[PDB]
Amino acid sequence: GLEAVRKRPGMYIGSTSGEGLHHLVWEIVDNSIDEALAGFAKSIQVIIEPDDSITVIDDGRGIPVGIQAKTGRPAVETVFTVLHGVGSSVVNALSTSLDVRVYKDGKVYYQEYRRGAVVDDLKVIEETDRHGTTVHFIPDPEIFTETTVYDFDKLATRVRELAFLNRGLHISIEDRREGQEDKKEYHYEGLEH
Numbered sequence: 070g071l072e073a074v075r076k077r078p079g080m081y082i083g084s085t086s087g088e089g090l091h092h093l094v095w096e097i098v099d100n101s102i103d104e105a106l107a108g109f110a111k112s113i114q115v116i117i118e119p120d121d122s123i124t125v126i127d128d129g130r131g132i133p134v135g136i137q138a139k140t141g142r143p144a145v146e147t148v149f150t151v152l153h154g155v156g157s158s159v160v161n162a163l164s165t166s167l168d169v170r171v172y173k174d175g176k177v178y179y180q181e182y183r184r185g186a187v188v189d190d191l192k193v194i195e196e197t198d199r200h201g202t203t204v205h206f207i208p209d210p211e212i213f214t215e216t217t218v219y220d221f222d223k224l225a226t227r228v229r230e231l232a233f234l235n236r237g238l239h240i241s242i243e244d245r246r247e248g249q250e251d252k253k254e255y256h257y258e259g260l261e262h
C-alpha cells in the first residue's frame with residue numbers, strides 16, 4: 070500500500086527536491102480544480118502557513134463521506150489512505166500529518182493521518198453553513214531532505230496560470246510566514262466581462 074510511496078517517493082512525485090515539495094500542492098489543488106470543472110467550486114485558497122505547511126480550501130460539494138460497500142469505510146478516508154486527481158493519498162503518505170475537513174449537509178467531518186496512517190475514525194466535529202473541502206498538510210522532512218521551504222513566487226506563478234486556464238475561477242495564494250506576509254488573488258472574467 071502507501072508504505073511503498075514513503076520508501077520510493079521518487080516514483081510517485083518525480084523528485085524529493087524542492088520540485089517534489091511543490092508538486093504536493095498541485096496534487097491537492099488539482100482535485101479542487103476538478104470540483105470547479107464539475108461546476109460546484111467557485112473559489113480556491115492556497116495558504117503557505119507560518120510553519121511551511123499548506124492549506125487548500127475550496128467551496129465545492131465536499132468529498133463524499135458515506136460508507137462504501139466495497140471497503141466498509143467512508144469514501145473520504147479511502148481518498149487519503151488508498152493508492153490509486155488520484156494523488157491525495159500520495160500527499161498524505163509524504164506528510165508528517167494531514168488533516169481533512171469536509172463541510173457538507175450542515176456538518177463538519179474531520180479526519181487526520183500521520184505519515185499516511187489514520188489517527189481515528191471520521192468524526193463530526195462542528196456544525197456549519199458552508200460547503201467544501203479543506204486539506205492541510207505538513208510535508209515530511211524525512212522525505213524532503215533538501216528543503217521543506219516553499220517558494221511563494223513559484224506557487225503564485227502557477228496559481229495565476231491555473232486561474233487563466235480555468236477562466237471564471239477565483240483562486241488565491243497567501244503567504245503567512247514571518248516578515249513576508251502576502252496575498253495575491255486571481256480571477257479572469259467569463260461572459261460577464
Ligand SMILES: CCc1[nH]c2nc(Oc3cncnc3)nc(N3C[C@@H]4[C@@H](N)[C@@H]4C3)c2c1Cl
Pocket residue numbers: 097098100101104125126127129130131132133148154155157202203204
Ligand atoms: C481541498 C481538496 C479537495 N477538494 C475536493 N472536492 C471534491 O469534491 C467532490 C464532491 N463530490 C464528488 N466528487 C468530488 N472531491 C475531492 N476528492 C474526491 C476524490 C477525487 N478523485 C479525490 C478527492 C476533493 C479534494 Cl482532495
